[PDB]
UniProtKB/Swiss-Prot annotation, chain A:
Subunit structure, interactors included: Binds to the mRNA channel of the chloroplast small ribosomal subunit and interacts with 16S sRNA nucleotides at the A-site and P-site.
Subcellular localization(s) per the UniProt record: Plastid, Chloroplast stroma
Function comment: Ribosome-binding factor involved in light- and temperature-dependent control of protein synthesis. Interacts with 16S sRNA nucleotides at the A-site and P-site, where it protects the decoding center and inhibits translation by preventing tRNA binding. Stabilizes 70S ribosomes against dissociation. May be recycled by the combined action of ribosome-recycling factor (RRF) and EF-G.
Family that this chain belongs to: Belongs to the HPF/YfiA ribosome-associated protein family. Long plastid HPF subfamily.
Provenance organism: Spinacia oleracea
Name of the protein described by the UniProt record: Ribosome-binding factor PSRP1, chloroplastic
Swiss-Prot record, chain B:
Coiled coil regions, renumbered to chain: 135-182
Family recorded in the similarity comment: Belongs to the RRF family.
Keywords, alphabetical: Chloroplast, Coiled coil, Plastid, Protein biosynthesis, Transit peptide
Purpose of the protein: Responsible for the release of ribosomes from messenger RNA at the termination of chloroplastic protein biosynthesis.
More about this protein: Expression seems to be light-independent.
Protein name: Ribosome-recycling factor, chloroplastic
GO biological process: plastid translation
Gene: RRF
Keyword Transcription regulation: no
Compartments (UniProt record): Plastid, Chloroplast stroma
A GO-annotated cellular component: chloroplast
RNA sequence: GUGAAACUAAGUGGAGGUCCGAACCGACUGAUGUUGAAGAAUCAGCGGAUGAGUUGUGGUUAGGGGUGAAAUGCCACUCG
RNA sequence: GACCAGGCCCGGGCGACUGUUUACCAAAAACACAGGUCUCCGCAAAGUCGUAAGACCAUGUAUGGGGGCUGACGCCUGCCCAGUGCCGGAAGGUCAAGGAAGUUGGUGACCUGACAGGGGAGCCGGCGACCGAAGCCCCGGUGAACGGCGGCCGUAACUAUAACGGUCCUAAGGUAGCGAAAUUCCUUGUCGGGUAAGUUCCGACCCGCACGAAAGGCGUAACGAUCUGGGCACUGUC
RNA sequence: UUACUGUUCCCUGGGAUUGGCUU
RNA sequence: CAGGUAGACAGUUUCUAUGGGGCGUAGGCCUCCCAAAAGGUAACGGAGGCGUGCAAAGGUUUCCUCGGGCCGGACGGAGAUUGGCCCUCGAGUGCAAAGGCAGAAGGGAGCUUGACUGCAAGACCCACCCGUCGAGCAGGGACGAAAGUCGGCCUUAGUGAUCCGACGGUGCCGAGUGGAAGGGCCGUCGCUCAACGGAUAAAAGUUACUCUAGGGAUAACAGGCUGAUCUUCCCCAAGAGUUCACAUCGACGGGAAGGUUUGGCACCUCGAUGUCGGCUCUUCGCCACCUGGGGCUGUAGUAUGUUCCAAGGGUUGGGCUG
RNA sequence: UAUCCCGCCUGGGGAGUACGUUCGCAAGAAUGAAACUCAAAGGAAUUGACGGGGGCCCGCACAAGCGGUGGAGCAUGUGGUUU
RNA sequence: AACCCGUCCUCAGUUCGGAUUGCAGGCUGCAACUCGCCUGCAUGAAGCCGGAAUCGCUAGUAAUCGCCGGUCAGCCAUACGG
């Protein structure tokens, strides 16, 4: 809790039901190490189908800057928007847990 | 155990019941509507969403839902590109209906009522009524304990508990009749 | 049968808080009686019947007690 | 061919079984039982009965004796020692009778004042620094010892549930197995089976009002003048 | 029975039964 | 001898009122109402309070008047403080209520301790014991110039008999006499003895293993009274009924009878009126389930629906459940 | 390289599972399927990548030093909202 | 320009700091309200070296002072390149 959030309509408009789905996922992965991070960067995109040529694909780029010189870069691609958000959140929880295991190595 | 204490202890415990009884009767009615006994469906198609330019949007915002007949449904999509997305979502939702297409619109056809379905479906209707009665009996079961807990703590008399308890059953039994009344009108819908 | 045993088939043997069932000791059901023949019995079935069995004779434990395979049951038709 | 002379079968509950019990309304699911466990007792034993002498235990000796609970056998018997009990400990605190460092009062051989004041010895008293055990407080152990073994919120992509998480309070919050039961108020719970029709009976679900592990839990062949449901045969029960 | 007041079994101290030499 | 220590054992207690008893509630004092124009007056009748407080909030002398509304003025606003006007007792009087009090009993100031000693004519109250007011007299004093005022508080709750003990004082007694011990007397203190006219310095439960003396003065069954409730009808007709209040229902409310429901009262019965259901065997009532005969119908017919006369006769056998 | 004899495998998952049988006080052992389902599973070795594997080395990478940003006010860009 | 010499300011929101606004004017341009740059006056905000964090720099470098140019009628350039 007490962490800001940044969305970005790269190639589309950000709806409200989508915004609720974003906060639900990263809210789980970040609530664990909530006292290490201050902000959450997000950038949603869309391509293909009716917009462009090729398969419909929606990207979700997520960057995270902790309170102690921590940098995370996560980028995945899926056929739907929610599925893209889900896969990235799993990657953040993996690397975000990797940091504590190194700090708590003793 | 003065009268002012009996009224207060009655008011506290009783309001927890009535405020809890209304929650059950409200949710129990929702359990009936989820059975979806092919009467009319302005509501079934509402929860199905579709993808429109990288945006999950409900069908209600993309197209109109008109019911020309109780056993059918008509969808008038404003965009032909969004027509196929509607057909995908209905099948992947696994509702139990085979949508068709006439090149412009999508038509559903709710199936008829079979004997094997009516019995297996009637078993579900009775089962929900059982889950409603036990919900009330748990409230009768919870309310009477608190009267007994006050009795052991010597804040009420044996005479007061027998009066409140006997008067509390009259309240719950009124709400019980609401369970059958919703069940009676529903059993008529099976035919 | 085996190296020897374990194991295993017959015969002998006659064990058991064993079985059926009289005496004997008990008293589950029902009927009858209920100013009874009888202050708990008669009738028809019923339980145990080599056992923790039954019984005689002669004795022991006496009431703020004794005794009790323990019911507050019994201790001269009398027992919180 | 008379008299005499077993009715049987399927399923479930309780108790293992043979036995014992309220003489005169209760024969049972109660009692006892073999076994199991805890604790006490080294013999001049514990325990028990007695005012005492002494007796039983025992003419026995820890593979024995006394006492409490449980109750064949089979699989198991969990968590809490804060409180209440029991065992052990000994640092200090509290502490009786009694002992006595002393202190104080009454009496008055005398002295003095103007009826009263003071007062030696001796006698008779009161008060009590300090010493003064066990026990209790205190510190640990112990549950087949007495006993106990919780609530309130939110969350899974249809609802519905909640694997998971948060919070409050306790000494700890009920583990295996079982469950409308000899326990379930609501109750004739609900589904299924059985019956033409089943508030009873069997199986299952679990919302266990208020199962639960030696006041034992779950099963269990055999046994029962035990309780309980169904069926064949039989018949004046009808 | 953790109702009141008491009795008994039992534990503990002082005294008698009860003495001697040492630390 | 002393201390500690097992209901192992003994002797006992364990209140009452009560529209039966118990669970509950209450127990004494003050105030208003019920209380019916003196006083007094009950109920498990309706409302609330007391178990004190003040060294000034007492006494005396003396000067003042609060409260509300409007208007004006920095912070300041509905409201602090200040000025003025208008109504006049609407405030306040330590606390509950009633009654009383306006140049005041309310609000300030100055000095003070009568919040005395020894009494007391005569009255109110009233089963008893208690309780209340009090002119006036002496003494020594406070305030006031003086006259005069003061024996606690504007009044009514703020409290506990007796026995025993304790502290201080005392010209009393002193078990042969003188003393002393001890006691008396005076002054006062010590109980939520609140179950509050207090049975002891000191006390809780259970009985379905039970027992005696009594009671229909007192419950459960039945009868009876009552008729809330129950049952069965009637009155009004907003509406429903394709339109149409009354074919059939009839809200909202109203007026009745009946004595089969659950109850209230506790009148008969406690030296006895034996219970639920069932078997057997009756017999009456009608507010009519069928059978007989009619009316209306939103009665085509068949079959109903509602209702009138009518109680002559009839009203099955089984499964589950005591 | 050769001969003789015994046991054992025939794609993976389901599965060493289920039913039944034998043994065992039990825990469990041995014997041992099918339905359905995938077009792979797997072995050796190579090449890179990766490693909270090892060794060596480098850059203002850290350390050390100097001065700033993040705060204040005002330039000016982006988002967002608004239009 | 920093800098040297001399006067004053002596630790103060100040002779530090120059935001915001009014008035009066100028230049560029057909055109200066939204929407240019400057002058003269008067107003004189916040701000007392700055959290968690984070950037540059190893020699004429960092730090600090000012000058020029391009695009350009003019200029919002405190930029960019020197
Ligand atoms: Mg035999
Ligand atoms: Mg026999
Ligand atoms: Mg006998
Ligand atoms: Mg016989
Ligand atoms: Mg016989
Ligand atoms: Mg026999
Ligand atoms: Mg036999
Ligand atoms: Mg004798
Ligand atoms: Mg005698
Ligand atoms: Mg006898
Ligand atoms: Mg026979
Ligand atoms: Mg049963
Ligand atoms: Mg038996
Ligand atoms: Mg027997
Ligand atoms: Mg008998
Ligand atoms: Mg028997
Ligand atoms: Mg008998
Ligand atoms: Mg017995
Ligand atoms: Mg001995
Ligand atoms: Mg037993
Ligand atoms: Mg303990
Ligand atoms: Mg301890
Ligand atoms: Mg479990
Ligand atoms: Mg049932
Ligand atoms: Mg139960
Ligand atoms: Mg039956
Ligand atoms: Mg069952
Ligand atoms: Mg039990
Ligand atoms: Mg245990
Ligand atoms: Mg136990
Ligand atoms: Mg048992
Ligand atoms: Mg038997
Ligand atoms: Mg006693
Ligand atoms: Mg005692
Ligand atoms: Mg006596
Ligand atoms: Mg009484
Ligand atoms: Mg009068
Ligand atoms: Mg009067
Ligand atoms: Mg007034
Ligand atoms: Mg005055
Ligand atoms: Mg004398
Ligand atoms: Mg006097
Ligand atoms: Mg009294
Ligand atoms: Mg009994
Ligand atoms: Mg008994
Ligand atoms: Mg009477
Ligand atoms: Mg009755
Ligand atoms: Mg009666
Ligand atoms: Mg009558
Ligand atoms: Mg009556
Ligand atoms: Mg008589
Ligand atoms: Mg009639
Ligand atoms: Mg490999
Ligand atoms: Mg550094
Ligand atoms: Mg400032
Ligand atoms: Mg400064
Ligand atoms: Mg800065
Ligand atoms: Mg370099």
């Amino acid at each position: 809790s007490s962490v800001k959030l940044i969305l970005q309509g790269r190639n589309l408009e950000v709806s409200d039901n989508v915004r609720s789905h974003v906060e639900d996922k990263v809210g789980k992965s970040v609530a664990k190490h909530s006292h290490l991070v201050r902000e959450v960067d997000v950038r949603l995109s869309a391509r293909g189908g009716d917009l462009s040529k090729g398969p419909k694909l929606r990207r979700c780029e997520v960057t995270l800057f902790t309170k102690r010189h921590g940098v995370i870069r996560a980028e995945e691609d899926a056929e739907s928007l929610y599925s893209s958000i889900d896969l990235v959140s799993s990657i953040i929880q993996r690397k975000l847990r990797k940091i504590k295991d190194k700090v708590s190595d003793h | 155990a003065t009268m002012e204490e009996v009224e207060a202890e009655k008011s506290l415990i009783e309001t927890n019941t009535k405020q809890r009884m209304e929650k059950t009767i409200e949710t129990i009615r929702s359990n009936f509507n989820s059975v979806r006994t092919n009467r009319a469906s302005p509501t079934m198609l509402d929860r199905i969403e579709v993808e429109y330019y990288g945006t999950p949007v409900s069908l209600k915002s993309i197209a109109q839902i008109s019911t020309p007949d109780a056993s059918s449904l008509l969808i008038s999509p404003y965009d032909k590109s969004s027509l196929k997305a509607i057909e995908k979502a209905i099948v992947t939702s696994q509702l139990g209906v085979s949508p068709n297409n006439d090149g412009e619109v999508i038509r559903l056809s709710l199936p008829p009522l079979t004997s094997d379905r009516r019995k297996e479906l009637a078993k579900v209707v009775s089962k929900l009524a059982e889950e409603g009665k036990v919900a009330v009996r748990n409230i009768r079961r919870d309310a009477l304990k608190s009267y007994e807990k006050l009795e052991k703590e010597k804040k009420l008399s044996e005479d007061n508990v027998k009066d409140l308890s006997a008067d509390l059953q009259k309240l719950t039994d009124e709400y019980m009749k609401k369970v059958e009344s919703i069940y009676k009108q529903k059993e008529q819908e099976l035919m």
